[PDB]
Amino acid sequence: RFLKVKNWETDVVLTDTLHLKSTLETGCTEHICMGSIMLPTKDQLFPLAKEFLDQYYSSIKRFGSKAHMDRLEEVNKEIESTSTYQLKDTELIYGAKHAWRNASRCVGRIQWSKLQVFDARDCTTAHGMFNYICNHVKYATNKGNLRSAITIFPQRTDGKHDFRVWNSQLIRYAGYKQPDGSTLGDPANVQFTEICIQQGWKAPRGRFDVLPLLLQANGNDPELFQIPPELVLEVPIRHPKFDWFKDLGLKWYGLPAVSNMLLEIGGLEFSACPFSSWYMGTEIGVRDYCDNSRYNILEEVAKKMDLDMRKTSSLWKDQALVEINIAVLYSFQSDKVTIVDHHSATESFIKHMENEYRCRGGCPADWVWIVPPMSGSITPVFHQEMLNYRLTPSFEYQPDPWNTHVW
Amino acid sequence: RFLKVKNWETDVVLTDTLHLKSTLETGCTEHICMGSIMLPVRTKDQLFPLAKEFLDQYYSSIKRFGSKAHMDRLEEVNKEIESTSTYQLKDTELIYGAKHAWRNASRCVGRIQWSKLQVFDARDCTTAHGMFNYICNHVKYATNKGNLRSAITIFPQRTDGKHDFRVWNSQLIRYAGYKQPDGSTLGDPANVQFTEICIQQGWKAPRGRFDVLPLLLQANGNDPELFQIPPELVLEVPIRHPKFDWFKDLGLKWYGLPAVSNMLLEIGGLEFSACPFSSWYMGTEIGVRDYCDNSRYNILEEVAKKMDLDMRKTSSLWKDQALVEINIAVLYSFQSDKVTIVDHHSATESFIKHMENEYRCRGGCPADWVWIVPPMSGSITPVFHQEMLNYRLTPSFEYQPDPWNTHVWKG
Ligand code: HEM
Ligand code: HEM
Ligand SMILES: C[C@H](O)[C@H](O)[C@H]1CNc2nc(N)[nH]c(=O)c2N1
Ligand SMILES: C[C@H](O)[C@H](O)[C@H]1CNc2nc(N)[nH]c(=O)c2N1
Ligand SMILES: NC(=[NH2+])NCCC[C@H](N)C(=O)O
Ligand SMILES: NC(=[NH2+])NCCC[C@H](N)C(=O)O
Ligand SMILES: [Zn+2]
Numbered sequence: 003r004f005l006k007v008k009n010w011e012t013d014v015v016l017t018d019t020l021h022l023k024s025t026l027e028t029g030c031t032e033h034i035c036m037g038s039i040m041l042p043t044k045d046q047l048f049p050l051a052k053e054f055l056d057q058y059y060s061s062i063k064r065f066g067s068k069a070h071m072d073r074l075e076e077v078n079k080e081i082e083s084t085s086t087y088q089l090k091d092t093e094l095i096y097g098a099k100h101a102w103r104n105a106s107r108c109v110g111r112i113q114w115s116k117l118q119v120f121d122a123r124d125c126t127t128a129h130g131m132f133n134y135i136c137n138h139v140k141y142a143t144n145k146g147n148l149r150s151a152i153t154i155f156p157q158r159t160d161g162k163h164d165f166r167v168w169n170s171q172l173i174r175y176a177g178y179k180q181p182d183g184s185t186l187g188d189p190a191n192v193q194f195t196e197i198c199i200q201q202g203w204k205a206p207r208g209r210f211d212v213l214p215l216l217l218q219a220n221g222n223d224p225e226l227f228q229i230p231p232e233l234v235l236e237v238p239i240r241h242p243k244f245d246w247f248k249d250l251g252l253k254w255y256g257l258p259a260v261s262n263m264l265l266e267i268g269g270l271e272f273s274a275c276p277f278s279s280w281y282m283g284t285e286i287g288v289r290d291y292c293d294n295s296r297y298n299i300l301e302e303v304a305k306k307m308d309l310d311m312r313k314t315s316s317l318w319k320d321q322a323l324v325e326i327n328i329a330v331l332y333s334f335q336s337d338k339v340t341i342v343d344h345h346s347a348t349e350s351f352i353k354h355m356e357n358e359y360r361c362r363g364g365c366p367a368d369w370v371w372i373v374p375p376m377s378g379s380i381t382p383v384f385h386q387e388m389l390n391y392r393l394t395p396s397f398e399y400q401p402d403p404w405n406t407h408v409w
Numbered sequence: 410r411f412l413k414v415k416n417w418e419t420d421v422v423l424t425d426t427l428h429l430k431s432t433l434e435t436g437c438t439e440h441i442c443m444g445s446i447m448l449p450v451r452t453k454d455q456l457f458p459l460a461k462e463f464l465d466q467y468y469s470s471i472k473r474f475g476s477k478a479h480m481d482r483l484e485e486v487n488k489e490i491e492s493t494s495t496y497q498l499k500d501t502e503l504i505y506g507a508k509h510a511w512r513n514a515s516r517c518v519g520r521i522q523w524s525k526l527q528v529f530d531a532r533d534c535t536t537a538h539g540m541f542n543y544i545c546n547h548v549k550y551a552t553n554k555g556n557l558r559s560a561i562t563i564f565p566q567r568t569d570g571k572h573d574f575r576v577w578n579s580q581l582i583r584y585a586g587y588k589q590p591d592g593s594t595l596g597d598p599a600n601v602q603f604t605e606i607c608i609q610q611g612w613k614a615p616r617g618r619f620d621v622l623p624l625l626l627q628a629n630g631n632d633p634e635l636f637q638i639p640p641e642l643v644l645e646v647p648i649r650h651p652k653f654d655w656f657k658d659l660g661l662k663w664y665g666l667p668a669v670s671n672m673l674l675e676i677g678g679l680e681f682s683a684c685p686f687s688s689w690y691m692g693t694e695i696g697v698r699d700y701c702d703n704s705r706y707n708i709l710e711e712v713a714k715k716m717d718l719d720m721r722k723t724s725s726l727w728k729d730q731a732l733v734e735i736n737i738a739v740l741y742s743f744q745s746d747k748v749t750i751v752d753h754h755s756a757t758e759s760f761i762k763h764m765e766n767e768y769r770c771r772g773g774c775p776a777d778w779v780w781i782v783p784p785m786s787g788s789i790t791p792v793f794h795q796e797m798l799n800y801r802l803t804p805s806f807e808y809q810p811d812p813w814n815t816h817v818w819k820g
Pocket of ligand 1: 282
C-alpha cells in the first residue's frame with residue numbers, strides 16, 4: 003500500500019512506503035484523529051530484538067549473512083539465559099542515531115547521521131552519572147560551536163533499578179512560586195525546583211538560576227550535583243537596534259539537553275539518555291520567552307517599544323514577538339554560539355524529508371510540531387503534507403520519576 | 410467511551426462524548442495519522458438511514474423526539490423515498506441542516522457565530538440566470554454596505570447526478586489569474602486555470618492584477634454560463650498602512666466578502682452541490698496567505714525592500730517583520746472603511762470560548778488543529794496550546810471535484 007503527500011506550494015508529490023514498516027500505534031482511529039494530542043517479558047523481547055537486528059544487518063548489507071544469523075542466535079540464547087541482552091557498540095550507535103532519525107517531532111533530523119554517542123552503560127552510581135554528564139556538556143558545548151551528543155546509561159532490567167535523570171533538560175532555569183501568587187524564574191520548572199530544594203538545594207531565588215542536576219542510579223534515591231558554572235555557556239540577550247533591550251535583563255543557556263526521555267532499541271529500554279544539540283531561535287524567543295505560562299515577556303517588550311496596546315488589531319503582540327526573536331538570534335550569533343532560525347531550519351527539513359523519501363521511502367513527521375510557533379505559513383513546512391507513524395528505535399516519553407519512584 | 414483534551418496554557422480539561430456520534434472516516438488509522446493531509450448518485454437503502462438519523466437529531470433539537478410529529482415526518486419521508494427515491498426538506502429542516510453543517514465544520518475558527526446564519530432557499534431555481542439573480546441578492550444582503558452578514562444560498566439538491574447545480578467559481582468574488590508567456594503570473598495564480606475557462610467561454614478579460622472574475626453558473630446539468638456581478642455590488646478595500654505612506658503605492662486592494670462556492674452541503678443524506686456561503690474575513694487569510702504565500706500574490710520581497718530591511722540573511726527575520734506590517738495594513742484598511750473583519754487574536758480567543766461552550770452544551774466540538782491555528786504567530790494565540798479532537802459529523806460541508814474535471818459537455 004502506497005501513500006502520497008503533496009506540497010501545496012511546489013506541487014511536489016512523494017510516495018510513502020515506509021509507513022508499512024510501522025509498528026506502534028498513533029492514538030488515531032478511522033473515526034477520530036488525535037494528531038494534536040500531546041501524549042496519546044522473554045517472549046515479548048525476542049521479536050523486538052530480531053526486528054532490530056534485521057534492520058541493523060540490512061543497514062550494513064549483511065542481511066542473512068552468517069554474522070547476522072550468529073548474532074541472531076547469540077542474542078537469542080542470551081535472552082533465554084539472562085532474560086535480557088546487551089548491544090554491541092556498533093548496534094547501540096545505530097540504534098541511537100535511528101531513534102533520532104525516527105523522531106517525527108524533530109525538525110533538526112537532517113543532522114541525524116552526525117551524532118556523538120557516549121556509552122555510559124558501565125555507570126553504576128549517581129556520582130558516575132554526574133561525571134559522564136559533565137563530559138557530555140563540555141564535549142557538546144565546544145566553546146559555543148555546538149555538537150550533537152547523547153549519553154546512554156544502563157538499560158532497565160527489572161524496573162526497580164532504573165537510571166533516571168530527574169531534570170527535563172540537563173540545563174534549565176529554576177522556578178519559584180512566590181506567596182503573592184506570581185512566579186519567579188521559569189514557571190515550567192516550579193515543581194522540579196521544589197523537589198531540589200526539598201532535597202537540600204540552596205536556592206539563590208533568581209530569574210535565571212541554573213538548576214542542580216538530580217541523578218538516580220540503579221533505582222537508588224536521587225542525589226544533587228551542581229554543574230561546574232564554567233561548563234554552562236550562556237547568552238545575554240540584546241537587540242541590534244534597541245539599546246533598551248539588554249535592560250530587560252534577559253539571558254538564555256546555549257545548550258538544549260532533553261534528559262527526561264526514554265530511548266528504546268531492539269526492545270531494550272534506556273530510561274536515562276540525555277541528548278543535546280543546538281537551539282532553533284523560536285524555541286526561546288517564541289515559546290520560552292513569550293508563552294503565557296513561561297517567561298511571558300510580551301507586554302514589557304511591547305511597553306518599551308511604545309506600541310498601541312489598546313486594541314489587539316494593532317498586532318502589537320505580533321510586532322513585539324518579531325523583535326524578541328530578532329534579538330535572540332542576534333545575541334547568539336554575536337557570541338558565536340550555534341543557533342538556527344526557523345526559516346533555515348524548516349528549509350533544511352524539506353531537503354531532508356525529500357532525501358528520506360528517495361533513499362528510505364518515507365520520513366515520519368508530526369506537522370503540528372514541525373511547523374514553527376511563528377510565521378508558520380511563510381516557512382515551507384506549512385505547505386508540506388506529512389504522514390505520521392511510529393518507527394523504532396524511538397524516543398518515547400515516560401512519567402516524571404517522582405510520580406513513580408519507590409523512595 | 411470518553412476522551413479528554415487538555416489546554417496546556419490553562420490546564421483546562423474537557424471530556425468529549427460527541428465523537429461517539431461520529432459517522433464518517435478521518436483518513437487516519439491506528440498505524441498512521443493523516444491529520445495534515447489536505448484531502449484524505451446514491452441509493453434508496455442508503456438514503457433512509459441517513460434521513461432517519463438527521464430527522465432524529467432535528468426532532469431531538471426541537472424537543473419532539475419520538476413525538477407524533479416526529480414519527481409522522483419519519484413516516485412521510487420514508488414513503489417519499491420509496492416513492493420518489495429521494496425527498497424534500499421542510500424549510501425548518503433545511504435551516505437546521507445548514508446551520509449545523511457550519512457547526513460541524515472542524516476547520517472553521519469562526520463557528521462561534523454558527524447560530525446566526527441567514528439561509529436563502531433557492532431550491533425553486535431552474536436556470537443559470539435564476540442562479541445569477543439569487544447570487545446577486547446574497548452578495549448584496551451579505552455585504553450590507555460593509556457591515557458583513559453571514560449567509561448561504563442553497564440551490565436544488567442532486568438527483569440523478571446528471572442535473573447538478575454547480576457554481577464553477579471557488580468563491581463568488583475572486584481575482585483572475587493570467588499566465589504570461591515569460592512564465593510569470595498576472596493577478597492571482599490560484600485562479601489561473603479558472604480564468605482560462607472563463608476566457609475560453611467568452612469572457613473579455615481586462616488582464617489586470619485585480620480583475621473580479623465573472624460568475625460561471627451551471628443549472629440542471631446544463632453547460633455553464635457567464636454573468637458579470639454588478640460592480641456596484643462588489644465591495645473592495647484599498648490597502649494602505651497607518652504609518653507607511655509608501656504602502657498604498659504598492660497598489661494593493663482586496664474584496665471584502667469571502668464567499669466559498671465550490672463546496673458540497675450534505676443534509677440528511679441529501680447532496681446540495683451548489684451552496685455558496687459567505688461571512689467576514691480573518692485578517693490573516695488575506696495578509697498572510699493571499700498576500701504572502703509564495704504561490705499567491707507573493708509580496709514579501711517588495712514590502713521588505715520598501716522597508717529597507719536586511720534581506721541578506723534570513724536570520725534578520727525580514728520576512729517576519731514585513732509579514733507583520735502587511736497584516737497591520739490589512740486590518741487597518743478594512744477598519745477604516747468600516748468593513749467587518751477580525752484579527753487572529755480575537756478570532757482564536759472567541760473559538761476557545763465557543764469550544765468550551767460546545768463541550769458544556771453539546772459534549773464536544775470537532776476541530777482541525779492544523780487549520781484552526783493561524784498561519785502567523787501561532788503560539789501566541791490560545792488555540793495553539795489547545796488540544797483538539799477531530800471527527801466528522803453530519804450535516805457537513807464536503808469537498809467535491811472541480812466541475813470541469815467531471816462535467817459532461819452538452820455543447
Ligand atoms: C541538530 C540540531 C537539532 C535541531 C535544530 C532540533 C530541533 C528540534 C525542535 C525545534 C524541536 C521542538 C522541541 C520543542 O518544541 O520542545 C525538537 C524536538 C525533538 N527533537 Fe530535535 N533538534 C536537533 C537535534 C536533535 C537530536 C540530536 C535529537 C536526539 C538525538 C533530537 C530529537 C528530538 C526529539 C525526540 C524531539 C521531541 C522531544 C519532545 O517531544 O519534547 N533532535 N527538535
Ligand atoms: C462569520 C465568521 C467566520 C469566520 C471568521 C470564519 C473563519 C474561517 C477561516 C479563517 C477559515 C480558514 C479558511 C482558509 O484557510 O481558507 C474557515 C474555514 C471554513 N469555514 Fe469559516 N468563517 C466564518 C463563517 C463561516 C460560515 C458562514 C460557514 C458556512 C456556513 C463557515 C464554514 C467554513 C468551512 C466549511 C471551512 C473549510 C473551508 C475549506 O476547507 O477550504 N464559516 N473559516
Ligand atoms: C495542543 C498542541 O498539541 C500543543 O500545544 C503542541 C502544539 N504544537 C507544538 N509544536 C512544537 N514544535 N513544540 C510544542 O511544545 C507544541 N505544543
Ligand atoms: C499541508 C498542510 O496541511 C496545508 O498547507 C494546510 C495546513 N494548515 C492550513 N490551515 C488553514 N486555516 N488554511 C490552509 O489553507 C492550511 N493549509
Ligand atoms: N533543539 C533542541 N534539541 N531542542 C530540545 C528542546 C528544547 C526546548 N524546546 C527549549 O526551548 O528549552
Ligand atoms: N472567513 C471565511 N469564510 N473564509 C473563506 C475562505 C476565504 C479564503 N481563506 C481567502 O483568503 O480567500
Ligand atoms: Zn490523525
